């Protein structure tokens, strides 16, 4: 991802990663996914009474902070959005659709993610 940084100035050192990507962002993706499969198993389990609880559609905003402050977290979140769109789960989709509005380097608004 830092390739243009290596051509702009001759940078031959490795770019560094984020810790909260490892401990907050990607575990937040995995947070949303395992709750997703939990309400799926609950739907596939009988005996749900009137007025069931929807999937939590609240958004942890440190996730969006990493989207809008880290290009790597940005683009991997974009491809996560595309993958869940291929899975087409409306609940998580509109859960994470806020916060994608403000994202790093307009990557959510770039050619790649928009085309996909």
């Amino acid at each position: 991802q830092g390739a243009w940084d290596m051509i702009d100035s001759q940078v031959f050192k490795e770019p560094k990663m984020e810790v909260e990507l490892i401990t907050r962002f990607l575990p937040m993706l995995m947070s949303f996914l395992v709750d997703d499969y939990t309400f799926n198993v609950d739907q596939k389990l009988p005996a749900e009474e009137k007025a069931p609880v929807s999937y939590p559609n609240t958004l942890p905003e440190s996730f969006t902070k990493f989207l809008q402050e880290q290009r790597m977290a940005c683009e991997v979140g974009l491809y996560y959005v595309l993958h869940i769109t291929k899975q087409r789960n409306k609940n998580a989709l509109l859960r994470l659709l806020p916060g994608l509005v403000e994202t790093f380097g307009d990557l959510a608004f770039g050619d790649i993610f928009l085309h996909l």
Binding site: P27, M30, S31, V34, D35, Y37, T38, V41
Partner: peptide, 12 residues
């Protein structure tokens, strides 16, 4: 920790 409790909640 949240993740592991959601894991164990899905097992149930």
């Amino acid at each position: 920790e949240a993740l592991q409790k959601k894991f164990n909640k899905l097992k149930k």
